[PDB]
Paper text:
PDE3A is a phosphodiesterase that catalyzes the hydrolysis of cyclic adenosine monophosphate (cAMP) or cyclic guanosine monophosphate (cGMP). A structurally diverse group of chemicals, including 17-β-estradiol (E2), anagrelide, nauclefine, and DNMDP, induces apoptosis by forming complexes with phosphodiesterase 3A (PDE3A) and Schlafen 12 protein (SLFN12). They do so by binding to the PDE3A enzymatic pocket that allows the compound-bound PDE3A to recruit and stabilize SLFN12, which in turn blocks protein translation, leading to apoptosis. The PDE3A-SLFN12 complexes exhibit a butterfly-like shape, forming a heterotetramer with these small molecules, which are packed in a shallow pocket in the catalytic domain of PDE3A.
In 2016, de Waal and their colleagues found that a synthetic chemical 6-(4-(diethylamino)-3-nitrophenyl)-5-methyl-4,5-dihydropyridazin-3(2H)-one, DNMDP, can induce cell death mediated by PDE3A and SLFN1217. One of the most interesting features of the PDE3A-SLFN12 complex-dependent apoptosis is that the pathway can be dose-dependently triggered by many structurally diverse compounds (e.g., anagrelide, DNMDP, and nauclefine) and cause cell death in HeLa cells. To elucidate the molecular basis of PDE3A-SLFN12 complex formation induced by the aforementioned compounds, we treated HeLa (SLFN12−/−) cells with their endogenous SLFN12 was knocked out that expressed Flag- and HA-tagged SLFN12 (K213R) variant with anagrelide, DNMDP, or nauclefine, and then purified the PDE3A-SLFN12 complexes using Flag-HA tandem antibody pull-down. To investigate the molecular basis of the PDE3A-SLFN12 complex triggered by those compounds, we subjected the purified protein complexes to single-particle cryo-EM analysis and determined the structures of the SLFN12-PDE3A complexes with anagrelide (3.4 Å resolution), DNMDP (3.2 Å) or nauclefine (3.2 Å). Garvie et al. also solved the structure of PDE3A/SLFN12 complex with DNMDP and reported the similar results recently. SLFN12’s helix is positioned at the mouth of the PDE3A enzymatic pocket, and the side chains of its L554, I557, and I558 residues comprise a highly hydrophobic moiety for interactions with the hydrophobic phenyl ring of anagrelide, together with the L910, I951, I968, F972, L1000, and F1004 residues of PDE3A. These hydrophobic interactions between these three molecules (anagrelide, DNMDP, and nauclefine) and SLFN12 “glue” the PDE3A and SLFN12 together.
Residue numbers in the entry:
A (entry chain D), C (entry chain B): 2 to 568
B (entry chain C), D (entry chain A): 669 to 778, 800 to 1028, 1070 to 1102
The structure:
């Protein structure tokens, strides 16, 4: 299937979708449609999962031998699936061939004007247009479900009265729904007679020149029961032809009871969801009519009647995915709609607003940012004031002891125009994770260019700590988007330093010269990463001392705490 | 019996110095010693000029005898303290007359009164006095004269914590700003010879008294980020400042007086330095009275371990900084085109901010070398 | 073309789209594609215009002789066009055949979760997917334009630095954009040589085996200049084939001059729109390369280079319509973008909120509605308290004089369970219209069922006033949706009464028994019509005395006025 | 010298009537005449029971001698007027003890104190006293005892328009509610034998004093639709009432005391009728003093042309109506299941509303037949 590749030195979720052919001309002349469909759906499930849980990278072994991607492209059946999930492809996907692999670097799905919170391969909520049943796309299923939730159900207008209208010969869609209502109650049908009505938003007609007809109803029926139930209800007549000449199918007795069992079987398997107090079921009724030619039974005709529902009705579960811990799963029907119906909190108190309102950055200086303040303005003796050592008390005690640490930190921040590193006794518990005690401390350098680095210091000559730092860089990358709201592309690099007494050297690991990324991942914004880092720490309830904004002045003027439900 | 007036209404010894009053760096401390500082009548004298300048003495028929009678009774109420005295009230009065009656590059003008000079010839140079009726401005000028009236010398946090009788009276909610507006208005209605607003309607005096109180209460700093957040929410995503709206014209005078109240670190380095010795001289007094009671001395209010530079660098980056960014992103700060736009007020803020960062650097670096 | 039918007794905008064939089997076997396309586009322009300006009805003369619609349906090309403009068809369209005409009753487009304010047949803003240029749909062009407006332009990342990446043989999309960058500057091309690159999001390749090639470039080029300019820019090479074998076209000199003139002609005709300070133009550059076989010139190859833009670039104007006064027009490019970029005001003060939050109406009584109050509780002597005569001072003075009026108004409200009629000296000026003085007064009955009626009283035995009442009923139906926010279907009926001295009779006109509507137009909600009527009058600044909520109690409490920028 | 206490602390003549105190239609006027009405000590006696009932006399160690010393000094300050007197304060105290310590069908309970009786056996019957800590409720009970203290007998609009010294003092912003909280708290800190809150911290007494003031100021009616709009914005679209939040627990006590303040037309027809003659008897007094000055007599405040029924029908539909709809849509009104939910409080509101619509119908119809 699709397994989380845990044998890679990327600080990201890597999915191994198996082997995949590639190229426009290679996918075209591929003489196996059932394979080419299964490969396309496997790269679409992976791309949907990574969009919903942070970001990641999809790794697919090239199947055809001589693939180049610089004279072969990707393919056309793949490009369509990419472009149906994402409005703008270049804002989310980057393609790169790395030797014997094809990699796709997926950004994280971010809240936009459309109001969607998660991506879906298919809602599987069908609707009924004038004559055809189609599937609700993402923005239709969002607006169909937000109304049902609002009115705690669905408002139908059961026949309290026939409207007193003038008397004039007029033809409407109730004329077809009326004629079919009497065709339904007909006890017998003459073979090769004429229909007084055609198909509309309340009537469907199926020919189905099939010998089995049961392996066909098994897969085409639940999308028509869903169409009718989701809009106004209707009828479905099986056993006609295209010329509106009633024929029926050559069905012997002892098979209609199986059919009625299969029909009632498939219809009781369809998922549903109620926004109302009671919990009804999909009301309906089947029926079989004879098509006696003149005195002999020529066949049969199955008439199905689906009444309008009160809430949603799925043809299958919502086809939306996500990766939970490993082994990417499918969003259950209770979680899927909870993304499509509910909002985010969005507190953003009045003090918090001006902490981020500085970030307008029109074409002008617009100085005085509040997320880059500090009382102590003297570290790194040979320098100007361009790095903010943030906690200012953990960054002081850590420098008193560990005599090699301070000179290593200053020798490291030499090549940075302007940044801010944020120490911590452990950056793993700050992100809601398990802590290991062999790690001395941590840091997080957020500079202008050179994407965020995560220094992991420690003084133990036994381990390597590649698993601690890499897993913490991964978790920090997903919270910066899924929680902090950062809407661009990020990668979190990593450095591991050994810090035995009497010496500050032996960089045990440097992840930057170990993994290659696309071009756009190496440039950040550094004012939206501080904003994003602020909100992620706040949502995790780990905001203690980063982002100083010292409150000796606030206390003189009685201004209150930053933000919480604690005063 | 009551304080009525000095015998010659408008003095003239202080001439040739009121002429250089249309400049942001008004030499206020030279006009002080110029006037006989034994008594103190600067507020009534600076007020008569700015009211004669705007032309409000005729648009409302304000009797000059009763006018000067009031404002002289006003300044006698301002206590004799280092910062919040009758000189600070004249600086906040002048600063609002400047901000509202000076050329703003790129302002779309629409009962109004423009400044006496104003040299009105351009179409890109509008002034706020042409977007706000004269009633809203005379309220904004009288709200600035009496906005620290009868100041006890302590801050709100001190009155609240020590349970002062002014804090139990006003329920620990704007203990001082409610007091200045009440004690000043209560003195106005006291005698009949103070009612210089005699030729006003009943609906005007109700709208006038409302705007005067709503401005004296916006000079509270505990509600600072509430105003700055509200003002950016109406210049960032809204249709801009809607000068036909009356709530928007109010929010623009509540920022105009908020900025004029804290305008120290936006003047020349000599003027800003004199005020800063004023305010900390007030803080140290509060630390004295705060230590003689058992309460821990407040930050920055310890005259033995002063941190005059730490306080001024936190103030400019936290309070005065983000306030001028909001008042500047809305395109209301008076400046001049560069043949792109020059801002004298914002430049002093940048220069003065860098001046204190040197004093903090050389004080930590020097201190670090001593304590190893 | 499409003309507003001004010869109909409907209180609605009627468009006469001309003659139109109808039916599934009739449209299918129609042997004129250019006609069937022109008829479909004519019914789509009309349906888009009515969606944007209130509602209306489309009237189309049946072209085929024998048509039924109860055994012939509508079509399939028509049904697709309906379903592309509207998410849910049955919420907006009703179909009805009335003798020798086919009528479509269009609801008014209403603000929904999608954030769209107007409907569009095509944005004509193309974008570039991985290999193909496609058109931005409604929700893509909304999110593409809202970002450009937010940043006052478009943020590109011009090569300030090449990212310091590891040294590993890696293939990316810049490899194709780089190879094409050197194919572009090539001075000569060998005939039938290979390309080192394929087509991607920066490269397009066109064969164009055409004799003219100029009537072809005229109509296919501006959608590729728009694709590249709207995303990252790219190259376009004309004169190759599908096998990547460079061929060129057999073009003689002095035609490349005309071509370069036509290319620069069509590209300077494309519309644009800037959200930035400067106003640049579409930067680009054309070029022609020889395809010399070995020593002879075999043809030519046109290379086009389009650089990334700073703002939007249209292939044509936005294809969105609206009916201004009559003779439905097309929305200009400045009006179209102001709908897709800006919001509505939405003031809704605290007092105004509780006037509407009463309308939650859960499955419980939830009494005390504030829009149905009145001091005087005694009119219509034989009755209970179920009708609110709203102005309460115009309703009193009008009843003192006009002795026949009061008994007529009470005999008319006999058959109403619960409603509220709102008098006025003239309901035309209240809706921003021209007044006529021959009309005595007006009224507006808003009952539970029986959609809103507009009584027009007058005492003049010369006129008929069918044009006054009908035009005022029309304007009231559009303001209720476009301004009041009513989100269901409405028709405004009309009655005209003669009120000579000594007599209350002579109903001159009754529009209810003159026009037939669909079934769903005869049932209103009556709590959302009062809410809708409240906001329409407020936006028109005509809210004076309707909706009493008397302020004798408010003045004792000290509460202020209802809402305005007047205090 | 100061008012200290009556000699026997807790009287017992008023027994067998405090037992029927757990009922919404508490016969308050019968307990009045039961007690010797010459002096008046109902507020201190009804307060000792409700505090003994809840169990706050042990959870905070409140000395009973100093407790009764205060509340007796409290009731003597309540003036002798027709409506806003020491009986109205006991009715608003009882009504908040009821609303917070009675079974609410469908309430999810989570330092707490439950009522003495409460018969706690169900899981669908929660009470508000189990969702709010005891500190927030003792503040809500002490805020209800002193919420009309020292009432002048006039309304805010009268003090503001006539420029009363209480209106110039508090700047025409909640002129009365600021006065009740100030004049009541100022009497508490006056003497040392009133400090029944002696076994509290410094941070508790700061949070306690904050909640007491924030409740006495929510009983202002000029800010009515602001609260009702805010409360529906947190039960309609939000996640509901978040009983772990401290702003949400505050907004629920600001509505609980708002509803208990105006609770007249939600009791039996005999009780609601007595209060209504009380309030209009207060209005007519204000009309007397308002006509002896030249000011036009206010609506409903003319004892010659009374409109007692017009006033009560506007009040129930405009003020009390939409307030109980909000307090009921949030699922907080105490009622009982119907084996769907029965509400005694909402039923009296509906019955009493229909009672005044008859009086208006028969008064317009009858009046119409006379004047033709
Ligand atoms: C407590 C008053 N305080 C706010 C922190 C304050 C400090 C400093 C100054 C100040 N600093 N520097 C100067 O030049 C003079 C004034 C504006 C003014 C105030 N204030 O609010 O009035
Ligand atoms: C001005 C006070 N007022 C508001 C209109 C008022 C009127 C009537 C009653 C009232 N009416 N009916 C009764 O049964 C007793 C009280 C609640 C109370 C108030 N009030 O705010 O206190
Ligand atoms: Mg002050
Ligand atoms: Mg001041
Ligand atoms: Mg009160
Ligand atoms: Mg009260
Ligand atoms: Zn349901
Ligand atoms: Zn541009």
């Amino acid at each position: 299937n699709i397994s989380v590749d845990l044998e890679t030195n990327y600080a990201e979720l890597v999915l191994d979708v198996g082997r995949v052919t590639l190229g426009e001309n290679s996918r075209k002349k591929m003489k196996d449609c059932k394979l080419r469909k299964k490969q396309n759906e496997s790269v679409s499930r992976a791309m949907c999962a990574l969009l919903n849980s942070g970001g990641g990278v999809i790794k697919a072994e090239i199947e055809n031998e001589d693939y180049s991607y610089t004279k072969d492209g990707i393919g056309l059946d793949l490009e369509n699936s990419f472009s149906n999930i994402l409005l703008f492809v270049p804002e989310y996907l980057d393609f790169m061939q790395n030797g014997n692999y094809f990699l796709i670097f997926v950004k994280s799905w971010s809240l936009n004007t459309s109001g969607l919170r998660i991506t879906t391969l298919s809602s599987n909520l069908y609707k009924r247009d004038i004559t055809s049943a189609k599937v609700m796309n993402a923005t239709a299923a969002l607006e169909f479900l937000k109304d049902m939730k609002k009115t705690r159900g669905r408002l139908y207008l059961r026949p309290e009265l026939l409207a007193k209208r003038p008397c004039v010969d007029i033809q409407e869609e109730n004329n077809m729904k009326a004629l079919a209502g009497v065709f339904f109650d007909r006890t017998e049908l003459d073979r090769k007679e004429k229909l007084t009505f055609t198909e509309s938003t309340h009537v469907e007609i199926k020919n189905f020149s099939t010998e089995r007809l049961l392996q066909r109803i098994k897969e085409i029926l639940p999308q028509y029961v869903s169409a009718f139930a989701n809009t106004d209800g209707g009828y479905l007549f099986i056993g006609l032809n295209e010329d509106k000449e009633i024929i029926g199918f050559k069905a012997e007795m002892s098979d209609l009871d199986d059919l009625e069992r299969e029909i009632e079987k498939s219809i009781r398997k369809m998922p549903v969801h109620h926004f109302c107090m009671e919990k009804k079921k999909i009301n309906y009724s089947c029926k079989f009519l004879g098509v006696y030619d003149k005195g002999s039974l020529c066949g049969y005709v199955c008439a199905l009647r689906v009444e309008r529902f009160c809430c949603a009705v799925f043809a299958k579960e919502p086809d939306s995915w996500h990766v939970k811990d490993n082994r990417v799963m499918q969003l259950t029907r209770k979680e899927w709609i909870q993304f499509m119906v509910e909002a985010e909190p969005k507190f953003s108190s009045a003090y918090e607003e001006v902490i981020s309102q500085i970030n307008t950055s029109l074409p002008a200086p617009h100085s005085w940012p509040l997320l880059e303040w500090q009382r102590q303005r003297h570290h790194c003796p040979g320098l100007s004031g361009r790095i903010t050592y943030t906690p200012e008390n953990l960054c002081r005690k850590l420098f008193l002891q560990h005599e090699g640490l301070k000179q290593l930190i200053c020798e490291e921040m030499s090549s940075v125009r302007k940044g801010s590193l944020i120490f911590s006794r452990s950056w793993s518990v700050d992100l809601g994770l398990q802590e290991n005690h062999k790690v001395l401390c941590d840091a997080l350098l957020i500079s202008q260019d050179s994407p965020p680095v995560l220094y992991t210091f420690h003084m133990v000559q036994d381990e390597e700590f590649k698993g601690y730092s890499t897993q913490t860089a991964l978790t920090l990358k997903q919270k910066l988007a899924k929680i902090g709201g950062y809407t661009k592309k990020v990668c979190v690099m990593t450095k591991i330093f050994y810090l035995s007494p009497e010496g500050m050297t032996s960089c045990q690991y440097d992840l930057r010269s170990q993994v290659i990324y696309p071009e756009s991942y190496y440039f950040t914004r550094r004012k939206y990463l501080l904003k994003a880092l602020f909100k992620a720490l706040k949502r995790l309830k780990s905001l203690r001392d980063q982002f100083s904004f010292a409150e000796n002045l606030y206390q003189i003027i009685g201004i209150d705490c930053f933000q919480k439900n604690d005063k | 019996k009551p304080i009525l007036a000095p015998e010659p209404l408008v003095m003239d010894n202080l001439d040739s110095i009121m002429e250089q009053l249309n400049t942001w760096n008004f030499p206020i401390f030279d006009l002080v010693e110029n006037i006989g500082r034994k008594c103190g009548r600067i507020l009534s004298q600076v007020s008569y000029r700015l009211f004669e300048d705007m032309g409000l003495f005729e648009a409302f028929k304000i009797p000059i005898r009763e006018f000067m009678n009031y404002f002289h009774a006003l300044e006698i109420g301002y206590r004799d303290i280092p910062y919040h005295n009758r000189i600070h009230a004249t600086d906040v009065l002048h600063a609002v007359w400047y901000l509202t009656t000076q050329p703003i590059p790129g302002l779309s003008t629409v009962g109004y009164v423009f400044s006496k000079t104003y040299n009105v010839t351009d179409d890109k140079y509008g002034c706020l006095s042409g977007n706000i009726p004269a009633l809203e401005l005379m309220a904004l000028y009288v709200a600035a004269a009496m906005h620290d009236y009868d100041h006890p010398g302590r801050t709100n946090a001190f009155l609240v914590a020590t349970s002062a009788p002014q804090a139990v009276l006003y329920n620990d909610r704007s203990v001082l700003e409610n007091h200045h507006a009440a004690a000043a208005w209560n003195l106005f209605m006291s005698r009949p010879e103070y009612n210089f607003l005699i030729n006003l309607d009943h609906v005007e005096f109700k709208h006038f008294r409302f705007l005067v109180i709503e401005a004296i209460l916006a000079t509270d700093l505990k509600k600072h980020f509430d105003f700055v957040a509200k003002f950016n929410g109406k210049v960032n995503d809204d249709v801009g400042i809607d000068w036909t709206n009356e709530n928007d014209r109010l929010l623009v005078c509540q920022m105009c007086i908020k900025l004029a109240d804290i305008n120290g670190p936006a003047k020349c380095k000599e003027l800003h330095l004199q005020w800063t010795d004023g305010i900390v001289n007030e803080f140290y007094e509060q630390g004295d009275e705060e230590a003689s009671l058992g309460l821990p001395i407040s930050p920055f209010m310890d005259r033995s371990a002063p941190q005059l530079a730490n306080l001024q660098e936190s103030f400019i980056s936290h309070i005065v900084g983000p306030l001028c960014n909001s008042y500047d992103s809305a395109g209301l700060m008076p400046g001049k085109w560069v043949e792109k736009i020059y801002c004298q007020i914002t430049q002093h803020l940048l220069q003065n901010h860098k001046m204190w960062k040197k004093v903090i650097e050389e004080e930590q670096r020097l201190a670090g070398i001593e304590n190893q």
